[PDB]
Coordinates of C-alpha atoms in Angstrom, one line a residue:
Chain A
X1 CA 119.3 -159.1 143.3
X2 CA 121.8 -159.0 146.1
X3 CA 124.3 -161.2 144.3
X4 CA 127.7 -161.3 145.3
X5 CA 131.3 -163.1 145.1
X6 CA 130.9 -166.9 144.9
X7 CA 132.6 -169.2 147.3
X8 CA 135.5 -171.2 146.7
X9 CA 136.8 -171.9 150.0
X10 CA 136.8 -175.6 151.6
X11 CA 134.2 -176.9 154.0
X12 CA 133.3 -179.8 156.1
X13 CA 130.4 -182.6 156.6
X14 CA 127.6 -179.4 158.3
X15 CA 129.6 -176.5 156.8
X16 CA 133.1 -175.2 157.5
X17 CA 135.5 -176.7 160.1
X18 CA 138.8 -177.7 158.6
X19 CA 140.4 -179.0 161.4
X20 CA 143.1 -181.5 160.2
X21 CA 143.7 -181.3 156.5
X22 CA 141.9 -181.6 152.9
X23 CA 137.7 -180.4 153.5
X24 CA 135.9 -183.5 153.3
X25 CA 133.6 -181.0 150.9
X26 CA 136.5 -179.5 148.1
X27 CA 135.9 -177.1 145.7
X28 CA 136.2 -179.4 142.8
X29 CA 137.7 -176.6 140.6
X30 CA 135.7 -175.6 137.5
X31 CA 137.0 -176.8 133.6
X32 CA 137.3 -174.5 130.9
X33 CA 135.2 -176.8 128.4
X34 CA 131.6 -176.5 128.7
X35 CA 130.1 -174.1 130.9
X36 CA 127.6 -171.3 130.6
X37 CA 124.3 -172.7 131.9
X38 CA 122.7 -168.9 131.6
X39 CA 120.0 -169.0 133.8
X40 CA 117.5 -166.6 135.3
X41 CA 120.1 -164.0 138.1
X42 CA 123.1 -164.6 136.3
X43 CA 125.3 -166.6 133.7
X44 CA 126.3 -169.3 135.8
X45 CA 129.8 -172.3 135.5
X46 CA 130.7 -175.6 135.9
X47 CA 132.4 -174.7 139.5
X48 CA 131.1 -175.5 142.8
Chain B
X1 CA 123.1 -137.4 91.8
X2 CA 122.7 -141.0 91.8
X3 CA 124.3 -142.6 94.3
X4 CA 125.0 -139.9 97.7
X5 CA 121.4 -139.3 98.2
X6 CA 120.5 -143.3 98.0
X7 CA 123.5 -144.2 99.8
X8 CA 123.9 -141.7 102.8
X9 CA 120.3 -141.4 103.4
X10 CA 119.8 -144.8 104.1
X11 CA 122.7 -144.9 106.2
X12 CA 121.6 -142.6 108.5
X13 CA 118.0 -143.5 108.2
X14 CA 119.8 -147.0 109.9
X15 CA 121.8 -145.0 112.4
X16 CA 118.7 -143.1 113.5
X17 CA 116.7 -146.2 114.4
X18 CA 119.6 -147.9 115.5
X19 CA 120.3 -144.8 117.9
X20 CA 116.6 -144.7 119.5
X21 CA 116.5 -148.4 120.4
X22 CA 119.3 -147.9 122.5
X23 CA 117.5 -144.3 123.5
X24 CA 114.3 -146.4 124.3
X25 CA 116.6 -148.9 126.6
X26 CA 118.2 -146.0 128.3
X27 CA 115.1 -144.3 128.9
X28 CA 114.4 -145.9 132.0
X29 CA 113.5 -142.3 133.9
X30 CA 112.2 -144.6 137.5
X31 CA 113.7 -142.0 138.8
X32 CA 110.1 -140.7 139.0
X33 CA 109.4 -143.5 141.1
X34 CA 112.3 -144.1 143.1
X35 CA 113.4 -140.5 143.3
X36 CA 110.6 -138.6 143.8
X37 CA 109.2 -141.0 146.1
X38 CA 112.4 -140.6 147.9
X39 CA 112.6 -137.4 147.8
X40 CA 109.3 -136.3 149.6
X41 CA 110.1 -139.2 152.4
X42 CA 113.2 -137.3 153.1
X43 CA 112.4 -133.3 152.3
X44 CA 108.6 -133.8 153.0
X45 CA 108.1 -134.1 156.4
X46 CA 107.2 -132.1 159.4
X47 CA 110.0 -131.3 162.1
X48 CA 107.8 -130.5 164.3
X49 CA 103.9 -132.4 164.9
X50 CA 102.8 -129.5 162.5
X51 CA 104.3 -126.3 161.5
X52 CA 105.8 -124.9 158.3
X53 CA 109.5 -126.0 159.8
X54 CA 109.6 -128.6 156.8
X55 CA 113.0 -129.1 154.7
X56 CA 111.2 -127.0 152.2
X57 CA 111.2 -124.3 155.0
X58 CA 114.0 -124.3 157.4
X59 CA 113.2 -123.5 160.6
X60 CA 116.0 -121.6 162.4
X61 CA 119.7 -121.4 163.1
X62 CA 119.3 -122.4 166.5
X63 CA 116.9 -124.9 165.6
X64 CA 119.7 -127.5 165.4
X65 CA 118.0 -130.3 167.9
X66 CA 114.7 -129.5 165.8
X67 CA 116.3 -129.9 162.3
X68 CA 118.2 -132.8 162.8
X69 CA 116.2 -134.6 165.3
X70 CA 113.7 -134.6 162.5
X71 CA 113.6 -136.0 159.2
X72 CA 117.1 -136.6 159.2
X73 CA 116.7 -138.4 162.4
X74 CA 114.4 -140.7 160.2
X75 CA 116.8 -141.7 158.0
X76 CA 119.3 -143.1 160.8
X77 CA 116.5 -144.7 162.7
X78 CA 113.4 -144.9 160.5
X79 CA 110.7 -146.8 161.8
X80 CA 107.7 -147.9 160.2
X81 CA 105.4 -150.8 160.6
X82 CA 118.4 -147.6 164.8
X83 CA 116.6 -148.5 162.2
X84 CA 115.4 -148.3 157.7
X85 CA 111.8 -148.2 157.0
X86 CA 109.8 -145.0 155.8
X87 CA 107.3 -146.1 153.5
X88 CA 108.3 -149.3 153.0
X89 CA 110.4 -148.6 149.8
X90 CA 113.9 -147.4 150.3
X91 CA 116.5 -149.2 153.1
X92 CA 119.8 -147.6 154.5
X93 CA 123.5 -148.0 153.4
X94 CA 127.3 -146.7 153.9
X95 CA 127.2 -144.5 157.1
X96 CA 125.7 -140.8 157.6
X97 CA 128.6 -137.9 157.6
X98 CA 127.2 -134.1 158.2
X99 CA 129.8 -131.2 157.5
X100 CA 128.8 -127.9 159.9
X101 CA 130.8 -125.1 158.1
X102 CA 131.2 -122.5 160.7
X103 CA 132.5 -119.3 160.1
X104 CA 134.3 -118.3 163.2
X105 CA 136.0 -115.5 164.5
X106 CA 138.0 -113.7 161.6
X107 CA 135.0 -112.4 159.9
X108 CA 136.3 -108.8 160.1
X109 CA 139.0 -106.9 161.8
X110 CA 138.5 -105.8 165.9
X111 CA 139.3 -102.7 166.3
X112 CA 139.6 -100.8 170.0
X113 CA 136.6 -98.9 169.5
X114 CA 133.4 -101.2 169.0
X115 CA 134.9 -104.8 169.5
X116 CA 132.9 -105.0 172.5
X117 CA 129.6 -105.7 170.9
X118 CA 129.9 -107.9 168.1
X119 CA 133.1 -109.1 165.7
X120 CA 132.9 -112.6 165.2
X121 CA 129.9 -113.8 162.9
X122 CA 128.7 -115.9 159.9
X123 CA 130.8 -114.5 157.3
X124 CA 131.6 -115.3 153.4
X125 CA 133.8 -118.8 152.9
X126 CA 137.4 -118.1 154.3
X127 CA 140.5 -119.8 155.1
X128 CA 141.5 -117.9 158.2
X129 CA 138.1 -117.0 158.9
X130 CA 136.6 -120.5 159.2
X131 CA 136.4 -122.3 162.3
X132 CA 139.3 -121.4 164.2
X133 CA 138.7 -122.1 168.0
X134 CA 135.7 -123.8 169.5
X135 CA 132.5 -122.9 167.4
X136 CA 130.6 -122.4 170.7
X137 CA 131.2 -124.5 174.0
X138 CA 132.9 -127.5 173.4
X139 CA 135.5 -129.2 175.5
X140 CA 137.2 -130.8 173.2
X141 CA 136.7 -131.4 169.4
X142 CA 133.3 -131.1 169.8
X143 CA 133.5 -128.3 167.7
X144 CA 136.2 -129.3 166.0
X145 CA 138.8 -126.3 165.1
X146 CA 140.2 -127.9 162.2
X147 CA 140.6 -127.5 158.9
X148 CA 139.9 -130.8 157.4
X149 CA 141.7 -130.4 153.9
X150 CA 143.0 -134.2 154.0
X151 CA 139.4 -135.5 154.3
X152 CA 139.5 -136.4 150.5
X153 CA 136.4 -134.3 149.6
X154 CA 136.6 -131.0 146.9
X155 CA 134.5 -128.2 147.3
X156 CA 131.3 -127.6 145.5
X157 CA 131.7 -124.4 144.4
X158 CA 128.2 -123.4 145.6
X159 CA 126.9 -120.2 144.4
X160 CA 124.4 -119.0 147.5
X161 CA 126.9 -120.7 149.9
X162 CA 130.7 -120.7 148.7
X163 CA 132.1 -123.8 149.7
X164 CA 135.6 -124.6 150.4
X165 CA 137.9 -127.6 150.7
X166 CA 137.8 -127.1 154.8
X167 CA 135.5 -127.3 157.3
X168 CA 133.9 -128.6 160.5
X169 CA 132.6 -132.2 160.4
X170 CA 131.5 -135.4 162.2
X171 CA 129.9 -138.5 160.8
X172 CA 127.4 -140.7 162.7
X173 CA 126.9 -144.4 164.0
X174 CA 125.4 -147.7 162.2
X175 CA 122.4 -146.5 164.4
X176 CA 120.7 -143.1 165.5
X177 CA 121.0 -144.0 169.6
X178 CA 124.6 -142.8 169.0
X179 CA 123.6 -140.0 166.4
X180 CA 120.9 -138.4 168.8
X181 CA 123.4 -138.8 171.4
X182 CA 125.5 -136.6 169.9
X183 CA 123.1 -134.1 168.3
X184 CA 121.9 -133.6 172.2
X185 CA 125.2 -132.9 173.0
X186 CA 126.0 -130.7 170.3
X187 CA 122.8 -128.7 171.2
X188 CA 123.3 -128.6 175.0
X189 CA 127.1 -127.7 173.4
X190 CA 127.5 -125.5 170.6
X191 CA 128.7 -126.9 167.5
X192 CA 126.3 -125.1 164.9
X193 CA 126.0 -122.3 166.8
X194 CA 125.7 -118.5 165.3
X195 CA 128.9 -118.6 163.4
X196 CA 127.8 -121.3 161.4
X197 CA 127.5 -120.1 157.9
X198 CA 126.0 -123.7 156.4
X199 CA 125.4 -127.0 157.1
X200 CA 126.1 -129.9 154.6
X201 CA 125.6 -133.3 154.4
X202 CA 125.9 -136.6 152.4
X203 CA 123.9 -140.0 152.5
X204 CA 123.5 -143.2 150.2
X205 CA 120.5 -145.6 149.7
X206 CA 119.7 -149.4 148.9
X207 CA 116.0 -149.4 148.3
X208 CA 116.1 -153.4 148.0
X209 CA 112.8 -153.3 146.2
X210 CA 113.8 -152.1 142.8
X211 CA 117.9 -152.1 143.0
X212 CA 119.7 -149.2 142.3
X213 CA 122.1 -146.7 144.8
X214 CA 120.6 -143.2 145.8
X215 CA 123.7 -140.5 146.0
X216 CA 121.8 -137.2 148.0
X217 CA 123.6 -134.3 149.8
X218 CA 121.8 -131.3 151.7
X219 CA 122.6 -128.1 152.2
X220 CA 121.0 -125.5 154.4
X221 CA 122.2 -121.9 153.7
X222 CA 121.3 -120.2 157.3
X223 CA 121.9 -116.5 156.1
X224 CA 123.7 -114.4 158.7
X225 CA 121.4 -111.8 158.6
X226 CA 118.4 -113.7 158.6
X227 CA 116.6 -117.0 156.7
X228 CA 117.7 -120.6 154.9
X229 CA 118.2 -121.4 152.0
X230 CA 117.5 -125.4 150.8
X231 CA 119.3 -127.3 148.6
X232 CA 118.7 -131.2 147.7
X233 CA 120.3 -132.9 144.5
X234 CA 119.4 -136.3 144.7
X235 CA 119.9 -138.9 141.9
X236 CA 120.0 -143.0 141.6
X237 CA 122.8 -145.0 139.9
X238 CA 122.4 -148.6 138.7
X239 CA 124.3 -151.5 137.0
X240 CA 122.2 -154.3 135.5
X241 CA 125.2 -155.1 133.5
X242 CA 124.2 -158.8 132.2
X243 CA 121.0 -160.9 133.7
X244 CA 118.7 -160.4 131.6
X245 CA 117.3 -161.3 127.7
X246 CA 117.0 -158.0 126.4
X247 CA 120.0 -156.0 127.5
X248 CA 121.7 -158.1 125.3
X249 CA 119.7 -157.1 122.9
X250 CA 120.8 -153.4 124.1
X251 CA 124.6 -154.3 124.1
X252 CA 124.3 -155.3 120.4
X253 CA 122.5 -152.7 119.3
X254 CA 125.7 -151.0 121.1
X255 CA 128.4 -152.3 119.2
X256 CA 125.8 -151.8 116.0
X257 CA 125.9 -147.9 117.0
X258 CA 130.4 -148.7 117.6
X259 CA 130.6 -149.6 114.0
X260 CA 128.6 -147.0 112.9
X261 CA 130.6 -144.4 114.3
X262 CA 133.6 -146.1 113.4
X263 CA 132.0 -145.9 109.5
X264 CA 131.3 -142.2 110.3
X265 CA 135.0 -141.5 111.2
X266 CA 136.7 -143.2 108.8
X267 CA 134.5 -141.5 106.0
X268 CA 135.0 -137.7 107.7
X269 CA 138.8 -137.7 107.2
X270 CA 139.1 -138.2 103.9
X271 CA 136.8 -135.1 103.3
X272 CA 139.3 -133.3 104.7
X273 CA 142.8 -134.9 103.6
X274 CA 141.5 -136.0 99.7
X275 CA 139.0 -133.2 99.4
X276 CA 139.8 -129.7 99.5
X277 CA 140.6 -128.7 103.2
X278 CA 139.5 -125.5 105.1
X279 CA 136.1 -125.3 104.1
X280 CA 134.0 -125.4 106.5
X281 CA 131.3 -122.3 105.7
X282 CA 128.5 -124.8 104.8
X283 CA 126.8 -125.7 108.2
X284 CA 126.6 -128.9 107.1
X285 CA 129.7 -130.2 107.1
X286 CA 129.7 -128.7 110.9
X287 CA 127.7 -130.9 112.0
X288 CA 129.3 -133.9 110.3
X289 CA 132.2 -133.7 112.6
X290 CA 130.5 -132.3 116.0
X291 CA 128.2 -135.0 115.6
X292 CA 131.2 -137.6 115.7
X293 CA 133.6 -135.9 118.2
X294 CA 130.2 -136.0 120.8
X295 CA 129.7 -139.2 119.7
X296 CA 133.3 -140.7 120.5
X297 CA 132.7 -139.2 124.0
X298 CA 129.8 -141.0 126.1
X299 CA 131.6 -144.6 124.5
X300 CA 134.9 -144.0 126.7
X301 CA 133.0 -143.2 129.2
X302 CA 129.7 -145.3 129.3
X303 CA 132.5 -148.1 129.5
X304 CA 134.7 -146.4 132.5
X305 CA 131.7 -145.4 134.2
X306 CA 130.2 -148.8 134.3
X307 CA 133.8 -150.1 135.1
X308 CA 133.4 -147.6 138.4
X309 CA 130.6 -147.9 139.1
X310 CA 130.9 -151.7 139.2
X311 CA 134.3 -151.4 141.3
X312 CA 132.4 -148.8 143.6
X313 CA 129.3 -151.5 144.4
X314 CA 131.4 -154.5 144.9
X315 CA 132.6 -152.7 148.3
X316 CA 129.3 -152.1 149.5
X317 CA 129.5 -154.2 152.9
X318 CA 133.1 -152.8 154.5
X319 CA 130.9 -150.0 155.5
X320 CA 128.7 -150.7 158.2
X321 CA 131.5 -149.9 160.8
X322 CA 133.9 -148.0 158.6
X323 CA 134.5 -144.4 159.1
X324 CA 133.2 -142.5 155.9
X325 CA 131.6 -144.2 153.0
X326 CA 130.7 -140.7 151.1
X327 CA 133.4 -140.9 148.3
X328 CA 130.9 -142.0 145.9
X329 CA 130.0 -138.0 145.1
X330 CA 133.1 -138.2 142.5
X331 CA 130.7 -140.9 140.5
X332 CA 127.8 -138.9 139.8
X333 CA 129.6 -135.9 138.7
X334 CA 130.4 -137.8 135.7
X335 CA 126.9 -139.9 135.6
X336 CA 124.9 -136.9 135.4
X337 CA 127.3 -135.7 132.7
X338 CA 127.1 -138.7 130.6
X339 CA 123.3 -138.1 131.5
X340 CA 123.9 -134.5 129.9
X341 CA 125.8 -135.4 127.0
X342 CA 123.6 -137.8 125.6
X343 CA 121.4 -135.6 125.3
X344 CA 123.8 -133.0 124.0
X345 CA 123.7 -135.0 120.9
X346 CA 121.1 -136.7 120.4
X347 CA 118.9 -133.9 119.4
X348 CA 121.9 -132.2 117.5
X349 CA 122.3 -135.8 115.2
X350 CA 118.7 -135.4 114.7
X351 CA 118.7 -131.7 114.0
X352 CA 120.2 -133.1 110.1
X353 CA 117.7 -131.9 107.5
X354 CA 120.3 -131.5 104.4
X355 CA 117.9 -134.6 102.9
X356 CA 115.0 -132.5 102.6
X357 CA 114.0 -128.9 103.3
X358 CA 112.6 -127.5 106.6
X359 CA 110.8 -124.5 105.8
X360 CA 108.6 -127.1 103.7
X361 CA 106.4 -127.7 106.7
X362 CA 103.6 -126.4 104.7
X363 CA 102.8 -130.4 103.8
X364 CA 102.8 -131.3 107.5
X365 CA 100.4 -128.8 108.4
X366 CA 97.8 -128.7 105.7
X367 CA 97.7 -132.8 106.0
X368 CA 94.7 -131.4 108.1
X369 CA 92.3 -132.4 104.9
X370 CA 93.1 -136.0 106.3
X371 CA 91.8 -135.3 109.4
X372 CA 88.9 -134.0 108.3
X373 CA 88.2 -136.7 105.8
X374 CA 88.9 -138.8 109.3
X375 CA 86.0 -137.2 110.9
X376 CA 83.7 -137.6 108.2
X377 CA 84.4 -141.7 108.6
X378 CA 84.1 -141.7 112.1
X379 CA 80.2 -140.7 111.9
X380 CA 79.8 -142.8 108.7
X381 CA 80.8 -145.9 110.4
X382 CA 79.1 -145.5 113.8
X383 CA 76.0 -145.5 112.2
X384 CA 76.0 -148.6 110.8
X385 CA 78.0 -149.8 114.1
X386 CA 75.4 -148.9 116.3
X387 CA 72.5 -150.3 114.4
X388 CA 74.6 -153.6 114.3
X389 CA 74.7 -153.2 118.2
X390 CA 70.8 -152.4 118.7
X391 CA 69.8 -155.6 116.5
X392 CA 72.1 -158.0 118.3
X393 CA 70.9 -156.1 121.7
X394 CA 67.2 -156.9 120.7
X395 CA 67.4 -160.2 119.1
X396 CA 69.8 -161.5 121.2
X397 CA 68.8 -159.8 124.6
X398 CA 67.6 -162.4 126.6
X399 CA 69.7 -165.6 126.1
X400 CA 73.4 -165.1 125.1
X401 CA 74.8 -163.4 128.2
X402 CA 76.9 -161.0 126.1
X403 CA 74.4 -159.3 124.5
X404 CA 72.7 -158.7 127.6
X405 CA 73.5 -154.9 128.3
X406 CA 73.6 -152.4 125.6
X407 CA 76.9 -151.0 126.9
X408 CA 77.9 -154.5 127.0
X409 CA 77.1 -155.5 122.7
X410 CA 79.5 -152.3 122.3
X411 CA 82.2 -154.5 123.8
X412 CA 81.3 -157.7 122.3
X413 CA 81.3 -156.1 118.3
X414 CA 84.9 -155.0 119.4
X415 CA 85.7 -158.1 120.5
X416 CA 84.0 -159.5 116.8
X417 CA 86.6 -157.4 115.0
X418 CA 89.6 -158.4 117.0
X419 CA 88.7 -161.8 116.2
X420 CA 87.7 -163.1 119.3
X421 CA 84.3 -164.8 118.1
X422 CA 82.2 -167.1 119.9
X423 CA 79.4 -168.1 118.0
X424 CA 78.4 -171.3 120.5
X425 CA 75.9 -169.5 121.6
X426 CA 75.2 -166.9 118.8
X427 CA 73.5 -168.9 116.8
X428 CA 72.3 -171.5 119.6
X429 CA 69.9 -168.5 120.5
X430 CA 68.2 -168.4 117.3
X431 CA 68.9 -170.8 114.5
X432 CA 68.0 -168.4 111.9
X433 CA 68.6 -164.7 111.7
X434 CA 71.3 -165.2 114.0
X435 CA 74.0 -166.5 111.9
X436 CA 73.0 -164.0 109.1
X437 CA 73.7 -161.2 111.5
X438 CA 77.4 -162.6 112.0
X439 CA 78.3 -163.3 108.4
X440 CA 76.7 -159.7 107.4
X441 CA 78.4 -157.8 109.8
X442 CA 81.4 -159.6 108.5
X443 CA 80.9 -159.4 105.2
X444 CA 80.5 -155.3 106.0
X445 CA 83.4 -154.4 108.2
X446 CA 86.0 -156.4 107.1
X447 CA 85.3 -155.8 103.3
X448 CA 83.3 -152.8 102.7
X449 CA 83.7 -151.3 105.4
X450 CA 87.3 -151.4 106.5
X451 CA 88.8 -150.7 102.8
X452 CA 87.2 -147.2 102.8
X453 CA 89.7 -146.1 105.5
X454 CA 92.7 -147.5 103.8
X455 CA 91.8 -145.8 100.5
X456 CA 91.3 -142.2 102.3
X457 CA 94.7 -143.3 103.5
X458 CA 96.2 -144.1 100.3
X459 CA 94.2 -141.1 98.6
X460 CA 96.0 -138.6 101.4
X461 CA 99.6 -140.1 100.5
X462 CA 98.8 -139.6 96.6
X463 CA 97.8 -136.0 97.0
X464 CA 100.6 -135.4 99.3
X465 CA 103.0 -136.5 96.9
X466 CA 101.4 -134.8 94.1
X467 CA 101.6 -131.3 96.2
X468 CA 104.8 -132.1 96.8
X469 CA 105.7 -132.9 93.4
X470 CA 104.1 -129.7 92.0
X471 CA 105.8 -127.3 94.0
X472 CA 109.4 -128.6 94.5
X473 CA 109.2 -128.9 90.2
X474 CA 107.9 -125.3 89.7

């Protein structure tokens, strides 16, 4: 229980500090084909 | 003749099963062990280290310091083994607010003779004779004189205290060091002092154990001339919308029961617009449409309520500072209604008997033959069951393990018929006169043994029918 709203900000090598531009760690935006693992909390996609 | 009575039947003989699936998937009802539970850690409690000053028996007006510096003080700062732990299965959420509705001066006109003595008191639920000046001492706004209409909240309506859309308030901290804080000063103060007619107040619930929200307002009714009345209408609210494998199961069976009242809709207006029209003196076509008008309710709003419900929970962490986080009482006054009207229905739907007669209960209550012809089984079949159980006791006494204890072979022959056989050992014991004792038993339970019930069975049916037969063709 206890979920929440994904992340989909940018981070860093550790974790977030964007200091000078593009997060060395990006998003890498999710497709619209193929997705829909559905696993055990919730139905999950092919973002992170 | 032909074709309504195979057609219609079936169709709701369908809808009925299709309806209590969904029945058995709403029937949660853990409200027995997540409300009742929570409702004795919070209104079952001593005040004091032992008295009768309980929430089930208030203690006294001026018992302020004692009433909230008690129970309610341990659900701010509830330690266990400031702070959320009472037995270990509820937590705390939103912030505390507590409404003191005091009922100032303007109870009753002062005139110049008798003013002296007494003319402001705890009166009936005013506008000019609420809390006009300080309720008691209070520099400031400790007892706030203010009418808070614009606080967003509608009156109750209560019966045994009338409540209005104004009123003295205050909310609390994140903590209790603040909220005891203020309760002291409110008691060295007066806040809730004599004038105070009746004290509300509102509170929410995680309960991380088994997830769900608790909604719960109290009300004491301190009677001006004497007593307290308590009030405590507690009730949980949940969304499981989709993690699971079997409330999908639940949503299709949902759009199963859509379509069928879609089907029943469609069908009901041309029995009106076709067929002829104003006839209604049947009380069966009645129910026809009732049944369906209920029925579109509870689908526009199962659907909105989940939507708020949904939109409510995803701002549950803004709170922990924030002001007031008691808006949610507009939710339940529709979930208990959609609790209400479900069952509204659901009897009414199955309260159809235009398939077959319901003074003919005569045929469900003589079935009591087949009870007795039950009991005369029962004593037939023990016999031989218990002679089985002393051979295998004897013979088998000593070596097996299983038939060791004669409360034990009882166990084991149960075991034999749910097929859970062994026979390793069974016959290892003794070579001969054991295996004959499994393949007789066999060879009488499962075939001469077992059939005798199912005939009786089938027997009961047949004369049922017959009955039946007989006196609906006389």
């Amino acid at each position: 229980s206890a979920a929440g709203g994904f992340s989909t900000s940018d981070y860093d090598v550790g974790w977030e500090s964007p200091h000078n531009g593009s997060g060395t760690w990006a998003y890498s935006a999710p497709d619209l084909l193929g997705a829909w693992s559905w696993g055990s909390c919730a139905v999950y996609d092919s973002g992170g | 003749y032909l074709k309504s009575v195979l057609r219609e039947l079936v169709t709701y003989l369908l809808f009925l099963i299709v309806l209590c699936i969904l029945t058995y998937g709403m029937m949660s009802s853990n409200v027995y062990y997540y409300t009742r539970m929570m409702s004795q850690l919070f209104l079952d409690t001593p005040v004091s280290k032992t008295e009768k000053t309980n929430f089930k028996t208030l203690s006294s007006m001026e018992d302020f310091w004692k009433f909230t510096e008690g129970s309610l003080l341990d659900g701010l700062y509830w330690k266990m083994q400031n702070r959320s732990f009472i037995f270990y299965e509820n937590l705390l959420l939103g912030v505390p607010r507590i409404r003191q509705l005091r009922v100032r001066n303007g109870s009753c006109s002062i005139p110049q003779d008798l003013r002296d003595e007494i003319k402001e008191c705890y009166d009936v639920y005013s506008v000019s004779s609420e809390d006009r000046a300080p309720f008691g001492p209070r520099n400031g706004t400790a007892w706030i004189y203010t009418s808070e209409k614009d606080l967003n909240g509608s009156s109750h309506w209560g019966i045994i205290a009338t409540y209005s859309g104004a009123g003295y308030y205050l909310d609390l901290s994140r903590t209790r060091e603040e909220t005891a804080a203020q309760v002291a000063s409110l008691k060295k103060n007066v806040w809730l002092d004599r004038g105070t007619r009746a004290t509300f107040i509102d509170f929410s619930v995680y309960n991380a154990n088994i997830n769900l929200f608790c909604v719960v307002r109290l009300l004491v009714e301190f009677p001006a001339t004497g007593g307290v009345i308590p009030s405590w209408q507690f009730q949980p609210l949940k969304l499981i919308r989709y993690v699971t494998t079997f409330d999908f199961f639940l949503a299709a069976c949902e759009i199963i029961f859509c379509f069928f009242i879609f089907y029943y809709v469609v069908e009901e207006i041309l029995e009106i617009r076709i067929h002829k029209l104003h006839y209604f003196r049947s009380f069966w076509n009645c129910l026809d449409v009732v049944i369906v008008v209920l029925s579109v309710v509870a689908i526009g709003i199962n659907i909105y309520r989940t939507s708020n419900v949904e939109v409510l929970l995803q701002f549950l962490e803004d709170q922990n500072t924030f002001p007031n986080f008691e808006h949610l009482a507009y939710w339940q006054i529709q979930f208990n209604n959609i609790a209400a009207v479900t069952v509204f229905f659901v009897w009414i739907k199955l309260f159809k008997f235009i398939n077959f007669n319901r003074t003919m209960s005569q045929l469900s209550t003589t079935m009591s033959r087949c009870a007795k012809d039950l009991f005369g089984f029962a004593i037939m079949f023990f016999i031989i069951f218990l002679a089985y159980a002393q051979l295998a006791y004897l013979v088998f006494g000593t070596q097996v393990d299983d038939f060791s204890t004669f409360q034990e072979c009882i166990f084991t022959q149960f075991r034999i018929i749910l097929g859970d056989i062994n026979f390793a050992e069974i016959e290892e014991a003794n070579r001969v006169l054991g295996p004959i004792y499994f393949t007789t038993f066999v060879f009488f339970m499962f075939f001469i043994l077992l059939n005798m019930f199912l005939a009786i069975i089938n027997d009961t049916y047949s004369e049922v029918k017959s009955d039946l037969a007989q006196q609906k063709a006389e």
